[PDB]
Structure 1
Amino acid sequence: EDDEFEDFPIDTWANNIWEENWDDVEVDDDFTNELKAELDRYKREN
């Protein structure tokens, strides 16, 4: 019960142990940096 599948070639190319939620790989990295500017930006005005 073996056939070559020569018709479907395996793709040719031109060249984290924990399971992830997507938002794991959201990983937008923003908040740490955006925050500080938000905090101080605020309290300079008040």
Structure 2
Amino acid sequence: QTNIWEENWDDVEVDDDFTNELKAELDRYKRENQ
């Protein structure tokens, strides 16, 4: 995969950011529900 990215630890994971926003909405939407 390519050559040199920042490499390690590790690939981490994926679908977080929007998931966060999806929740950041929901969170705040829950907080809207709050």
* CA positional deviation for 1:44: 1.1
Q: What are the superposed Cα offsets for residues 1-46 of structure 1, whole Å, 9 maximum, x if unpaired?
A: xxxxxxxxxxxxxx99999999999999752231120111001122
- State the percentage of identical aligned residues: 97
Deviates more, 1:35-44 or 1:19-28: 19-28
* Structure-1 residue corresponding to 2:30: 43
**Larger Rg, first or second structure (1 or 2):** 1
> Root-mean-square deviation (CA), in Å?
5.1
Cα distance in 1 between the residues matched to 2:4 and 2:30: 42
Normalised TM-score (structure 2): 0.30
More helix by share: 2
Structure 1 segments of 4 or more deviating over 4 A? 15-30
2:17 match: 30
How many residue pairs get aligned? The number is 32
Structure 2 gap ranges (5+): none
